[PDB]
Amino acid sequence: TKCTLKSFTVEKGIYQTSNFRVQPTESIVRFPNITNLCPFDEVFNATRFASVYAWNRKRISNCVADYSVLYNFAPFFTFKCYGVSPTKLNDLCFTNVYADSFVIRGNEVRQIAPGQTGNIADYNYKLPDDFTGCVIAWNSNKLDSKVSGNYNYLYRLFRKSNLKPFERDISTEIYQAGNKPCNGVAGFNCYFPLRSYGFRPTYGVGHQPYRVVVLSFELLHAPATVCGPKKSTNLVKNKCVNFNFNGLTGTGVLTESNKKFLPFQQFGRDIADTTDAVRDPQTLEILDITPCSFGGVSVITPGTNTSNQVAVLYQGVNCTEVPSNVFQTRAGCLIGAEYVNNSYECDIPIGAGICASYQTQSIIAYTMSLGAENSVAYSNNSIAIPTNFTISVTTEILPVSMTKTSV
Amino acid sequence: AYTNSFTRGVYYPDKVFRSSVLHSTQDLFLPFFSNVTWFHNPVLPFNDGVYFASIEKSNIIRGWIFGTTLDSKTQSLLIVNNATNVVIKVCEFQFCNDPFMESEFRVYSSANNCTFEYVSKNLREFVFKNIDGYFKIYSKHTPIDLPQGFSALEPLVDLPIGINITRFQTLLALHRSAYYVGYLQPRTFLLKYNENGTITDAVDCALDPLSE
Amino acid sequence: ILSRLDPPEAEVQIDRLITGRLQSLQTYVTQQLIRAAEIRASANLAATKMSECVLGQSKRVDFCGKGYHLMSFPQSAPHGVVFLHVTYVPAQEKNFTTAPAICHDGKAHFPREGVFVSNGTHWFVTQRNFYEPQIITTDNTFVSGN
Amino acid sequence: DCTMYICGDSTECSNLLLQYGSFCTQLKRALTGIAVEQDKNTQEVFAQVKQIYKTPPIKYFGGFNFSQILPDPSKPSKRSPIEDLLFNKVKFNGLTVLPPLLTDEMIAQYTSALLAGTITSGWTFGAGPALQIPFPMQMAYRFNGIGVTQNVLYENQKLIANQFNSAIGKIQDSLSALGKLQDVVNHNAQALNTLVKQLSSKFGAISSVLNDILSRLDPPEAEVQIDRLITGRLQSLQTYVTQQLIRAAEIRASANLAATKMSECVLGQSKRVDFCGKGYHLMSFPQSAPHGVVFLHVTYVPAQEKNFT
Amino acid sequence: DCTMYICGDSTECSNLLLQYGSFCTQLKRALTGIAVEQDKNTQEVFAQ
Ligand SMILES: *[C@@H]1O[C@H](CO)[C@@H](O[C@@H]2O[C@H](CO)[C@@H](O)[C@H](O)[C@H]2NC(C)=O)[C@H](O)[C@H]1NC(C)=O
Ligand SMILES: *[C@@H]1O[C@H](CO)[C@@H](O[C@@H]2O[C@H](CO)[C@@H](O)[C@H](O)[C@H]2NC(C)=O)[C@H](O)[C@H]1NC(C)=O
Ligand SMILES: *[C@@H]1O[C@H](CO)[C@@H](O[C@@H]2O[C@H](CO)[C@@H](O)[C@H](O)[C@H]2NC(C)=O)[C@H](O)[C@H]1NC(C)=O
Ligand SMILES: *[C@@H]1O[C@H](CO)[C@@H](O[C@@H]2O[C@H](CO)[C@@H](O)[C@H](O)[C@H]2NC(C)=O)[C@H](O)[C@H]1NC(C)=O
Ligand SMILES: *[C@@H]1O[C@H](CO)[C@@H](O[C@@H]2O[C@H](CO)[C@@H](O)[C@H](O)[C@H]2NC(C)=O)[C@H](O)[C@H]1NC(C)=O
Ligand SMILES: *[C@@H]1O[C@H](CO)[C@@H](O[C@@H]2O[C@H](CO)[C@@H](O)[C@H](O)[C@H]2NC(C)=O)[C@H](O)[C@H]1NC(C)=O
Ligand SMILES: *[C@@H]1O[C@H](CO)[C@@H](O[C@@H]2O[C@H](CO)[C@@H](O)[C@H](O)[C@H]2NC(C)=O)[C@H](O)[C@H]1NC(C)=O
Ligand SMILES: *[C@@H]1O[C@H](CO)[C@@H](O[C@@H]2O[C@H](CO)[C@@H](O)[C@H](O)[C@H]2NC(C)=O)[C@H](O)[C@H]1NC(C)=O
Ligand SMILES: *[C@@H]1O[C@H](CO)[C@@H](O)[C@H](O)[C@H]1NC(C)=O
Ligand SMILES: *[C@@H]1O[C@H](CO)[C@@H](O)[C@H](O)[C@H]1NC(C)=O
Ligand SMILES: *[C@@H]1O[C@H](CO)[C@@H](O)[C@H](O)[C@H]1NC(C)=O
Ligand SMILES: *[C@@H]1O[C@H](CO)[C@@H](O)[C@H](O)[C@H]1NC(C)=O
Ligand SMILES: *[C@@H]1O[C@H](CO)[C@@H](O)[C@H](O)[C@H]1NC(C)=O
Ligand SMILES: *[C@@H]1O[C@H](CO)[C@@H](O)[C@H](O)[C@H]1NC(C)=O
Ligand SMILES: *[C@@H]1O[C@H](CO)[C@@H](O)[C@H](O)[C@H]1NC(C)=O
Ligand SMILES: *[C@@H]1O[C@H](CO)[C@@H](O)[C@H](O)[C@H]1NC(C)=O
């Protein structure tokens, strides 16, 4: 009070000096679930993969993508990601997620990469120079290699000119290296263009069959598409904290409501268009949002020339949310004064019929009186007439002028 | 023929629940007491959204076709509903010029490059609009020339397609063994909500000086 | 601003300060006009009391002090006026029995001014503001009705 | 609260408020200085009696029936049957409403004490001690004060009591009007709503939300745009305060008139033409209203003139 | 007429002016409130 008034002597009265202000605890970010996990489950588990020269191609759609099963899978040998980091796969959003899969020899995985050369990367599968995808590749000896030779997987090693990025060529036209046209017969300078990896379990690393999958994103023009997954954090109630309901950011106390939304509405607003209720995405229950507990703080003083005792009123603050003599009034919680049952003339007005005084010493605070009471001795044939009088003098004061200023 | 709408083509402008609150909204609606064309067929324009009502206990309407060219060489939307449920689909099609045992589906003969799949008297109202690449559909089926009354339409789908639309057609079930087409304009209404949160009345803020 | 900045940018910085301090003057002058209307209303009340409390006798209740107005004396105060209000206050009442009229010769007599009182055994006429009884005569009363 | 209106729980904005000086000091004092006067306005109208007077249990005054203006011991709190019509007919982001000092129950007793004094003691309690006098004799004095002899009342006492009792009973029909009280509530409510709605203006910034600008932009630029929001919102808030001072003077002017009528119409008999109702003033009775006072003016009106030479 | 003073029938200015909220509604209400009382002031002095 002294600091607000800029003085060291405060006169008796009541002074507004500051403000209460309840603070929120914890930060809960709520959401729904995942619904459609858009099943990566098969492109990484397809029992019959495809030979490299005719490689399969699966395109993800609007879905929920949870890459945590990939990174945390635990059984890999090569996982390199070029466009975006391996951990930020769950906070971005892309339009079309293409997924390629095939099998190749061991020491050729160094060729599934932007800007390489060799009999495999040249013309079987060409990644561009501005790749943005994510390459995963592991060993699959025990699943795809069968003793005696498994001659299913082919790989082209003859072609006119190198491939184009993301292009595909499956023809079986007989090569022609010489000058004499072939007429489709193998032999001298007319070679078949397809060979086969003969896998066996008794091979060294670098020749056992590896399985390779590559992801590739591209954001053509869509407004929004498959993004990363949301997240949790237990939901508490009756504790004004910091909340987020799938985009709705705010502060306040969450409580069970009694409103009934329509079966398509997420949240409600009050008059003047401020959000006052939401629906929990997971449990589908309506919760009201009330503001915390802020308010002014006033200091009640008898005057520094009387005492240095003081009581404090927290305006419209409940007496359970403030952090002796605690008194609840319709104007807030009064602490540091007692509540008596007598009634005096008002001295320091608090509000709603309550006043404070320095009488009974610490500091107290009762009801408000209304003055003395008196019955007039009325009857139907009685009169009262004065027999004497006094002359009284009283003052009245009125202002008439101010100082004249000019700027 | 042409008919006179009364108070039709009012739909929930958005989510957001609400109670007794005379809320004012600006959006694309079918104006009250408007001039709606009548059909008993040819390619119709789109220009900005479509109102589509109909009346009949049986199901004569067997989907719609939307897009810019209504032909091959470019992608288009196709909405059908057999006795199972609604099937949204967005591919490049080749549509019959006259699309329509008990064997059916002679509408198209090509379905390339599909970018979206989905499977699962009487008045059947629809509101179609296409904003920022989103194709919205509102609908409601209420049992009983159209009558006179008010009924707000709720969202049905949310389709992140990207498709452009300038024209569309309709599909009918022929006999081998009636519908309306309005369009939407930017108008302002004053919407009355009940305590359950539904729209019970509306005022068209561009009709008569009293409405202003 | 100029000492450490070129004109092209100094014009913007000075224009911001000018706008801020010009807003200060608008706030100041607007409040002086609103507050001058209040002191003017007070000066009108003081001028009205000067006429009606000092240059005459008022019957307006509580306009010239508490009690029955007799007279007032002005005093000068800095930027104001002080009124010394002289009032008449009755004191020390007694109760009496009363009646609206008196019958004599079959006729009703009413007081010209005053009230009828009884001291317990005899009735008198008194004036209403000071107890001063006189005998009820035909010169004190008038006749009207039966 | 200027900080919660302008910034709204934002530390970047709160520190920027320090560059504007003492604007919040002016805002708090301007609104507080006119809030204190509002309790003074109600004390000067109703607290014009030192004692709390009561009527006798034998509510019957020369034939006059006052039961519709006196408290009725069987109602919410303690209102007259007529005051019940008067009361029955009528935390966002810093915008706080303070309660009045006097409750409606406290105003009702002030008004019931004024009513008891004028019925049992006439106009004597306002110049000293309350002096009892029977009511029929009070009304005869009041006729004398307007130029009518007193015998005209005493020979027609039953007629005047019948006419008064019917005239009072017509008041409840006219009430079951108060626009002078409803306008005050509506004008302030519309100003509070407008103040909130100015929180969705850009004032030449890119976004209206302080947690938006600073987050996606550039701090050096966010500071200039946040200062534009602070300036625009401060100007809105200053406009609010200026209009409250202009409106506070209108309420005080009305409260000064209501206090003047209380003394000159209820605690006495006035000769001022039209000041205490239309006709020759006899008496007045106060009634409380939610944010005001209602006076019942009783006047004498002559009728049925004849021609003479 | 708020718009005609500030912008003077210019679609670029008038569209930017909308970004300031409803100041042009407050100006009209204030002027209407004091323009109605001008007839009330005259009516109560002479219609006696
Ligand atoms: C989102 O997923 C949760 C599970 O993670 C679903 O919770 C189920 O809700 C039903 C009632 O609707 C309960 O009977 C189940 O027991 C819940 N499951 C669990 C594991 O608690 C929730 O319903 C899903 N939300 C939607 C909209 O489908
Ligand atoms: C990938 O394939 C393997 C085998 O084909 C699946 O393995 C299953 O493992 C779980 C956990 O031990 C068992 O409970 C199942 O019985 C196994 N499947 C079978 C058919 O026996 C594995 O689940 C597949 N990946 C995913 C993500 O489902
Ligand atoms: C006039 O008589 C009345 C009674 O008729 C007196 O009022 C009584 O006063 C006494 C003393 O204060 C109280 O104890 C009684 O309760 C009063 N009676 C009633 C009915 O109120 C009054 O004091 C007398 N006046 C004078 C000057 O003596
Ligand atoms: C009216 O009141 C005054 C006092 O205010 C009375 O005057 C006093 O009378 C006593 C004797 O009773 C004297 O001793 C005092 O000196 C007087 N005071 C003054 C100032 O002169 C006066 O007598 C009272 N009148 C009646 C009739 O009782
Ligand atoms: C009422 O006052 C009268 C007059 O003073 C008293 O009556 C007596 O009247 C005769 C004349 O008729 C006088 O000579 C006596 O001196 C009077 N006596 C007194 C005591 O004053 C009468 O006594 C008074 N009544 C009461 C009840 O006090
Ligand atoms: C004064 O008027 C009141 C009505 O304002 C009278 O009260 C009514 O009395 C009649 C007869 O007993 C009842 O039928 C009504 O129900 C009463 N009204 C209420 C509201 O209670 C009252 O009787 C009158 N007093 C006198 C002395 O005549
Ligand atoms: C004065 O006027 C009143 C009416 O304002 C007269 O009183 C009415 O008289 C009629 C006829 O006798 C009765 O039916 C009514 O009931 C009376 N009204 C009331 C309220 O009592 C009165 O008679 C007139 N006086 C004279 C002398 O003519
Ligand atoms: C007093 O007498 C005058 C006539 O001297 C009456 O005047 C009449 O007024 C009415 C209109 O109110 C005219 O239509 C008549 O023509 C007038 N009469 C005459 C003879 O001129 C007046 O009405 C009388 N007043 C009363 C109260 O009876
Ligand atoms: C204030 O202090 C002075 C001494 O400095 C003392 O005389 C006076 O009584 C005090 N006032 C009160 C109300 O205590
Ligand atoms: C404070 O909260 C408790 C419940 O925790 C409630 O019982 C009490 O009535 C509240 N006080 C006020 C003044 O609202
Ligand atoms: C006041 O009186 C009430 C009963 O009316 C009693 O319950 C309460 O304890 C009293 N308060 C004090 C402080 O004695
Ligand atoms: C609708 O407008 C057309 C002209 O575009 C007109 O021929 C037709 O009569 C109108 N319909 C109604 C119901 O007014
Ligand atoms: C319904 O139509 C869709 C789309 O043509 C089709 O996929 C589905 O198999 C149909 N259902 C039946 C039962 O024919
Ligand atoms: C669309 O289909 C054509 C063949 O009809 C094909 O050439 C083209 O690559 C396809 N587009 C996409 C994006 O798959
Ligand atoms: C729709 O057509 C417009 C031209 O009318 C074009 O500018 C726009 O890019 C198209 N939208 C899409 C999603 O292709
Ligand atoms: C819907 O509103 C009606 C009143 O129109 C009400 O009676 C009914 O209880 C409401 N239904 C629900 C589920 O709240």
Author numbering:
A (entry chain B): 299 to 621, 640 to 676, 690 to 736
B (entry chain C): 27 to 66, 81 to 140, 153 to 172, 187 to 210, 215 to 247, 264 to 298
C (entry chain B): 980 to 1125
D (entry chain C): 737 to 826, 854 to 939, 944 to 1076
E (entry chain A): 737 to 784
Quote the study on this structure.
Here we report the cryo-EM structures of the trimeric S proteins from the BA.1, BA.2, BA.3, and BA.4/BA.5 subvariants, with BA.4 and BA.5 sharing the same S protein mutations, each in complex with the surface receptor ACE2. The five sublineages of Omicron exhibit numerous mutations in the S protein, which is responsible for receptor recognition and facilitates fusion with host cells. The RBD may exhibit “up” and “down” conformations in reference to the viral surface, and only the “up” RBD can expose the binding site which is responsible for mediating the interaction with the peptidase domain (PD) of ACE2. This interaction triggers the conformational changes of the trimeric S protein to further expose the fusion peptide in S2, which then facilitates membrane fusion with host cells.
